[PDB]
Symmetry: C4
Subunit: 388 residues, 4 copies
C-alpha cells in the first residue's frame, strides 16, 4: 500500500514467549530438508517468514559433506513459511549468494545477495523480485552484509556492509536504498573500531543496529541511524555485561567508546534491544563457545558503564548449541507499540559435532510479552547419533 513509517516505540519487555521453531535437523533426518546456516526472520505486511542461506544440498544428501565452508556457488538466500523446515519443495529462492539481508518497505521487499570470489565479489539488490542495482567490491576482501533483516522508514532502507579485513581495520559503509536504488552512502562514523553482521530494528523513526567487532571488542558496537537525515553515529555498549563470544569474564565496569579487550579476531552475530530501562541483551551462556543462550535485562546498558542485570530468561541451556542471533519485529502487527522479537540459530554438526561431515542449523524465535511468563529451554532436539 504505502511505505511503512516507524511511528511507534517498543512495548515493555517483561519476558519472552515462544514465537516460532522449525525443528529442521530433527525432521531433516528423514525428509528433504536443505542444509542451511545464517538464518533470520523477516515480515511482510501479511506474513512473517523464515530466511537462511541454503548450501544447495539436503542434509542426508552426499553433497552435505563439506557444508562447514561459508562461500560457494551453491548457496542462495531462501525463505519459507514460519515454523516449517526449509525443504526442497516449500522454499522460495530470493537471490543467489553467500551473504544477505532483506526487508519489506511496506509496498514491496528488497533482498540483497552478495556472491563472487573473495577478491571480486558484488552485491545485487533485488526489489519486487527483479534485480535493480549492483555494487562491486570496494576493498577486494569478502564484501559482506548483515545476515539478518534491514529496516525501512518511508521507503528508505539503510543497510550496513563491510569490505576488507576481518581481523583489522576494514571499510564499512551504510547504504541508503529507496525502491532498490542508492540514494546515498556513507563511510562508518563514530567510535566503533570494526563492524560486522549488524542486527537492526527501528522505533520512533530511528534505526538501531547491534553489530560485531570481530577484531578486538567483546562488548558490541552499536550504530544508530537516522533514515530521514540519512546520517548515523556509532559507539559501543557501555555495560560490563559482555555479549560477544568468545569473550573474557564480565568485569565490574565496561567501556563506552573502545573495544573491551581479551579476545581477538573472533565473535558471533548477536543483537540487543536498547531502550532505557527497557533494555535487554542476548548472549551465549558460555564465554568460550557458541553454547547456550540467555536474555538479560540490563537497564541503560548502552550508556551506563556499570550496568548489571536485573532480570533474565534462559533460552537455550549451556549444554546445547546456539550460534547466530538477530532482531526482527512485525512492524505491521496491530497495537500501540512494536513487540520486540529475535531468533537464535541452533548450529549442529561441524566443527563441534565432528562425527558427521555436514554443518546445518534449526531456528528458534521468541517475541516479547508484557506479562512475566515462565521459561523453558528450546534446544535443536536432534540426536546426532541417528545420522551416523
Amino acid at each position: 500500500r504505502d511505505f511503512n513509517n516507524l511511528t511507534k516505540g517498543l512495548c515493555t519487555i517483561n519476558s519472552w514467549h515462544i514465537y516460532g521453531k522449525d525443528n529442521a535437523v530433527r525432521i531433516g533426518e528423514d525428509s528433504d530438508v536443505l542444509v542451511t546456516r545464517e538464518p533470520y526472520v523477516s515480515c511482510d505486511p501479511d506474513e512473517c517468514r523464515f530466511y537462511a542461506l541454503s548450501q544447495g544440498t539436503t542434509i542426508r544428501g552426499k553433497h552435505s559433506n563439506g557444508t562447514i565452508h561459508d562461500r560457494s556457488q551453491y548457496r542462495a538466500l531462501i525463505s519459507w513459511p514460519l515454523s516449517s523446515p526449509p525443504t526442497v519443495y516449500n522454499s522460495r529462492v530470493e537471490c543467489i549468494g553467500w551473504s544477505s539481508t532483506s526487508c519489506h518497505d511496506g509496498k514491496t521487499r528488497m533482498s540483497i545477495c552478495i556472491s563472487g570470489p573473495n577478491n571480486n565479489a558484488s552485491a545485487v539488490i533485488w526489489y519486487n523480485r527483479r534485480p535493480v542495482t549492483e555494487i562491486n567490491t570496494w576493498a577486494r576482501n569478502i564484501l559482506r552484509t548483515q545476515e539478518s533483516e534491514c529496516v525501512c522508514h518511508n521507503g528508505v532502507c539503510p543497510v550496513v556492509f563491510t569490505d576488507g579485513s576481518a581481523t583489522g581495520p576494514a571499510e564499512t559503509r551504510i547504504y541508503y536504498f529507496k525502491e532498490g536504488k542508492i540514494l546515498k552512502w556513507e563511510p562508518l562514523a563514530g567510535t566503533a573500531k570494526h563492524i560486522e553482521e549488524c542486527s537492526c530494528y527501528g522505533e520512533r523513526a530511528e534505526i538501531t543496529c547491534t553489530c560485531r567487532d570481530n577484531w578486538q571488542g567483546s562488548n558490541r558496537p552499536v550504530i544508530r541511524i537516522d533514515p530521514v537525515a540519512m546520517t548515523h553515529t556509532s559507539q559501543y555498549i557501555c555495560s560490563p555485561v559482555l555479549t560477544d563470544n568468545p569473550r573474557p569474564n564480565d568485569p565490574t565496569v565496561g567501556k563506552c567508546n573502545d573495544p573491551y579487550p581479551g579476545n581477538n579476531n573472533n565473535g558471533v552475530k548477536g543483537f540487543s534491544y536498547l531502550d532505557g530501562v527497557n533494555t535487554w541483551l542476548g548472549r551465549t551462556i558460555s564465554i568460550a563457545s557458541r553454547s547456550g543462550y540467555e536474555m538479560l535485562k540490563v537497564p541503560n546498558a548502552l550508556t551506563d558503564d556499570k550496568s548489571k542485570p536485573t532480570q533474565g530468561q534462559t533460552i537455550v541451556l549451556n549444554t546445547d548449541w546456539s550460534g547466530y542471533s538477530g532482531s526482527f519485529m512485525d512492524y505491521w502487527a496491530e497495537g500501540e507499540c512494536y513487540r520486540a522479537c529475535f531468533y537464535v540459530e541452533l548450529i549442529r554438526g561441524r566443527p563441534k559435532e565432528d562425527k558427521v561431515w555436514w554443518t546445518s542449523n534449526s531456528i528458534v524465535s521468541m517475541c516479547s510479552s508484557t506479562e512475566f511468563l515462565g521459561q523453558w529451554d528450546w534446544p535443536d532436539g536432534a540426536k546426532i547419533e541417528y545420522f551416523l
Copy 2:
C-alpha cells in the same frame, strides 16, 4: 466479513455419513508424514481443515522413537487440507506448543498454544496469525486446554482451560476472548467436579461443551456457556449410558450432578450432541480400552437419568483402535440448520502396539444426515507389521 453468530439450531440427526479420512499411517509407511496426536477439525468460512499436535518428526524417521510422551519442545499445532495426511510439505504451523484449541470467529482465526515445563507453562493467543495475548500458569501444574475447536458468537470465543492436578480438584477457568484479547474470565461453576479437554459446539446463541472428568466420573461433565452474558453452568450427563473410558458397565440409572463412580484417574476426550430427543452420544465400544467407537441416540440424555439408546451406528469396530473424539461444525455451510460433525483419532503404536517405538494416529470424521444411511466401519487401515 462480519463476526459469525450462532443463529441456527442443529439439523435432525438420523445417521452419520463419512466426511473425511486421511489414512495417515498407511500413507506414512512410505511418505514424509509427521507423527501426530490430539487431532481435530476446524472450519473457516471458505475451507475446513485438519489440525493436530505434531511431534516434530516423521513416522519413519528415527526421532519417532519416544513419541508416546505428550510434552516436549518439538510439538506444534499444525493444520493441513481436509483428508490429506499431515506431511512435512503441506502442513502449516499455527503455533508452538503441546496443548491447543483454535476457532474462526467469522473475520479471522484465533489459535492458542500452551508450552513450557509442567510447573511454568504459558498460553499464547494468536489472532490473524500474530501473537496478541499471553497467560501464565495459575496453578503451576500443566496448564492445558481443549484439544479441539472453540466456538465464537459475535466475536466472543470462550475457551475452557484447566490448571492443576489431573487426579484431584483442579482450577478450571472459562476465558472469553474477542479479537485475541481477554474480555473476562470465570472460575468453573456448577456441579462438575473435574474438567478436562472440552469438546464444544454452538447453536441458537448457546455453546455446549462435553468434557472429561479425569478424577472420578465415568459419566461426562457438561458446561453450558452463554457467550452474550458471558456466564456458564455445569452438570453431568444424567444418562446411564456411560461414555468415558475406561468405565464400569452401564447401570440402569445414572447421576445428574455427581460423577458416577467405578474408575478413577483416567478417561478420554469425548463429545456429545445434546438436543432433546435429537441427542447422540459417542463412546468407545470397549469399557476397558480406547477400542472401537459407536454413536448412540439417547433421547434426553442430559436430563433423563434412565435414558437408554433408541438407535445407533458403529463407527470403528471393537477390534480396531480409536482414541480422542471431538465435535466441530461448519458454521458457514448453506442451509437452515447446523449439521453436526465429529472426528475420532485412530491411535496406532504405543502403548497398545509395542512392536514399534512410536505413537501416532490417523483421523476419521463424519457429519450428520437426515436420511437413515447404511453404516460401515472406518479403521486406521495400517498393518503394523510393515513398520518392523
Copy 3:
C-alpha cells in the same frame, strides 16, 4: 459466474492431438505417487484437472499389496494438476469413496462419492466442497456411478447410478441435481438392458452417455438425456463395429435395440462421440483383453446397423495395456464449437502383470483437431522389472 449452458455443437473431428499425460507409474517408481484406478478428467471454468480413486497408499509403499481390490475404506476421489502425477503432496481430496463422478456447473463443482459395504452403501453429494445431500442404496448391491465426469446445463447436472446385480437386470436411475439437491429421479427407460459406468458429454442442450452393458451386450448402450425437460431415452449403438471388451469379432450388421451376444458378464468402461458423420468410437484393439486402444470414425454409428470405419487413429499399441476410457470437454474454452476429448487409463500390475502385488495406472488424454495430424502411440512407459 453464471450457470454454463450447452449452447454449442461439436467441432469437426479429423484427428486427435495429445492433451495430457502424467507418466504416473514411471515417476512413481521413485517418488511418492499414490496408487490409483478409475481415473478421468474434468474442467472448471479456469482449469482442467486429473481425477481418480486413490487406494490410500503409494506404489512403492508396502500397503500397495492388494490394491487389485475395488472397494475399501481407504479409497478417495482425488484431483491434481493436469499432467502432474497423483502425488501425496499435490493431490486434493474431493470426497471419500470407491465410486464417483464430478462436474462443474459453471458456478461451482459437484462431486459425488459412494462408500459402504456392498449391501449398505450410500452416495453423498458435495457441492462447493461441503456435503449437501445423501442417498442410501436402493437395491442393496453395490450402489455405483459413472467413474467419469457428469455434465450440467443451466444448473441441472444429471448423473446415472446403478444398484443391483452386475450380471443380470439391475436398477438404474438418472438423478437430476441442481446445486447439490435432487430435483427429480427416473428409472432407466428405453431399450438398454443393463447400464454401468456411463461416459457423457453435452452439446446443443442435449447430454449423450455411452455406457457399458456388463450383462450381455458387446455393443454399447447409449442414454440420451434432455436436461431441460428432465427426461431420457436409451438404445444401443447400431454399428457392427463392437466396442466393449471382451467381445466377439465384428459382424457385418449390428443391433440397435438389443445387446449383441457373444460375451457375458464382463466389459470395460468406454465412450463415443455420436454426431452424424462426425462420429468416432473408441475401443481396445484386443477383443480378449484390455490391450491396445484405437479411435475409429464410423459415420452414423448410432443409427446405421451396417456402418463401418472410414478413418482411424491408434492411441495405444496392442502390445501395451489400456483400461477404462471416458469423455470430457472443456466447456469453457473459447471458440465456436466444443472440442471433443477423452482419456484412457493405462493399467499396470495385477491381474496381467503378476510379478508385482499392486495394481495402478497412469493416464493419457487427447482432444480433437480439425487438421489431419500424424499419429503416435502413447503407452504407460514403465518397466515392471524395475519394481521387482
Copy 4:
C-alpha cells in the same frame, strides 16, 4: 492487461551479474528431481520461471537409464519457480512433447509442444492453457522449434520452426501467431543456409534471433524479424569470433553471408545480443566440446568481418560442462531499457560422463549490469561419484 510492445532499447552491458541457479543435479542426488534437458527461462508480467523438457522420471529413479535419447512419449515442457530445482512436486506441465517454445504476450502465455514419430510429428499451440491450433509436419523429418522463449509485440509472436534434414538443406518457416492462431507463415529468406534452435529477444519493435547452422556453419545465422510488417531477413554474424561448437579456431576475418567452413553436421544452441558497439557473444570455451562458457564483447560483430573482443567475462570454466544457451529478458521490469539476460544449460551424465546411465542438467542464468562487476565461475557443482 494489454499486449506488451517492444518499446525500449537494450541497456548498456558492461558486465553480467548472477540472476538464477537451481543446483538441480546436486540437490537431485537426494530429492525427487526430474531428469531434464533443453532448459530456458521465460517471464510473465509478474514472475519469471525456469522451463525445460522433462524426461518423465527422477534422476535417482531407474527409468533415468536411457535419458540420453531426445524424443520419447515421456517428455513434457514443464516450468517451475526461479532457482528452485525441477521437482516432481513443484513442476507445472505446460504441454506434452519433445521440442518447444513459450512466451507471454502481455495478456497471457502461448506454449508450443511438438510430439510424434520422426516422420509424423505435429505441433500444438496452447494459449491461456488450452490447445488452440495444430500444425502437422510438412517435410516429415523431425518438426522442431526454438528450445527457448519466443517474443511478442502487440500480440504477434513469431516462432521459427524447421522440418527436414539436420545435415542438409531443410524447410524452415516463421509462423506469426496472435492469441494462438496463425496469422501468416513465411519460408526462410536471406542468406542463412540452415536454421535450428533460434534464441531470440526483442527491442524497439524488432526481434533478433541467433540460431544454429547444424549443416556447415561455425559462425551463427541471424534472423531479424519485423513483427508489425510480418517479414524477416537472415544472414550470418560477420565476426571472426566463431561461436558454434564444435568449430575451427578463430580466423582473422569472418564471413557475413556464408557459413564459415571447418565442421559439418553438428553444433549447439547459442545466442548473442547484437547492438552496435553494445554487442556481446556467448560461446563454449572449448572448440571441441560443450565445455566451458564465456561472454565476449565484440563491437559490431554482426556487420564487421574483422571484429575482435574488447572485453569478456568467463561464466563456466573450461574444466566444467556447459551445453545449450539462450536469451530471454524480463520485458515487464521497471526501467528505461531492457536488461539482457541468458541462461546456460550445464549438462551432466552421458555422453561425457559415462559412469552413470542418465543425462540431465542444471541451469545458470545471468543478466546484464551497467557496472563492471567482478566475475566468478558457476559450474553445476555435482560430484558424479556420489551417483555411482
